[model samples]
Target: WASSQLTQLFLSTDLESLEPTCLSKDTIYQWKVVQTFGDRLRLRQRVLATAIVLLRRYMLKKNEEKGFSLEALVATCIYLSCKVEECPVHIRTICNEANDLWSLKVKLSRSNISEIEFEIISVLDAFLIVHHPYTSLEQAFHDGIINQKQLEFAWSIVNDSYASSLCLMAHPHQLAYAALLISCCNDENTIPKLLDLIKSTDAFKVILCVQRIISIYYFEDIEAAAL
Candidate 1:
């Protein structure tokens, strides 16, 4: 289920009118899907993240303003993501989920899904890159700069808050990194320390990254406020 706050935010923002920069509208839609599923949909996160990475790489080569709308593009991205992740769901199921959650009114027939699959393949140019947070987190854990409990808790927070698409945003990296460090020191009682750490790590850096990501992915509404 989507958070009431996120639902309100989506209702307030007009995603259909969004344009694209280095990022695409499909990326933002995937972000919304991530928020909707919350933690229970871990596979959905992998699917959506994989899709966004593919979309980013694809857009680096071709443009798709005329062939499809943002809604269709995002739907296709999710579809492709699922396939790449080898956890495929029916296209109608994904479409229904979108409609139920985000009020996306699209008829995702088999042909449409097939067409989008082809598009994804063409855009990807036949390349695959795997991404996993485990690599960095594992390295940090071994450094012994933080304790096990603290590391576990901080990693959970970072993973949970990822529903906000903050991980894809910029400045949060260092703040997130600092949050991990502080988490070890305070044990389970790290929110206050985390807040202080965030303030100290220059929150403005993450803010700038968020602004840039939003601006690039949602250039159609250039005048809208940042998230």
Candidate 2:
């Protein structure tokens, strides 16, 4: 999702009229389907990641607008990802797996994957370069900002950021800083230095990321408890 897209869709409701909830399902489908099926199917991470990003972008649009079947969307994402991500999955295989996915989430005809792919691609407008917080976290580790344990926690926090719109709204550094802050914010010893660091500069964007991340966790906690 683009920054403008985030501004428009970030409300708890639909583009002010809809509620997006992939997590609401017991299935809990999001970016990880790409990882799970990618691992099982022996796909490259970039392939799965790119596919996941496209699928999410498409879904974000759909939840507010069209409300297409998630299974087909997932299939199209992986199928289309294979093409763009440098290793194409056979249409038959893509459909077979896709049909197996949600029982024709893409379309009935395997041949129709093309049309489905085009519809999704049209929404994406050829925008496929997704910058993630991975590199930012790696640089944070290298720069001695966070130790290995903190990096691990930060990575998890960054991953959780995907559950929300932070990836679409904030840059990698901002996310990395927020992740690192989340990891150490609980420790008394780290509090002063963390505050010092936060107070210096880059506080605004980083704090926004942190607040959003914190809200996600709080909401999840409440959700899980209710469940």
C-alpha lDDT values of all predictions: 0.53, 0.66
Per-residue CA lDDT of model 2 for 181-211, tens digit only, reads 8897776765565455554357887977887
Off by over 4 Å in 1: 1-30, 37-42, 99-106, 142-145, 148-227
With candidate 2 superimposed using the best TM-score fit, by how many Å does residue 15's alpha carbon deviate from the native? Answer: 9.9
> For residues 1-227, what per-residue lDDT tens digits would candidate 1 score against the true structure?
55655423433154545533323454455555444542223455556556655555555556654465455666677667776779877777766665554454556667866787687686776665536443445556676544677678666644443333334344445535544653554455444444453554566654443344334323435436453
lDDT of 2: 0.66
User: Model 2 has how many clashing residue pairs?
Assistant: 4
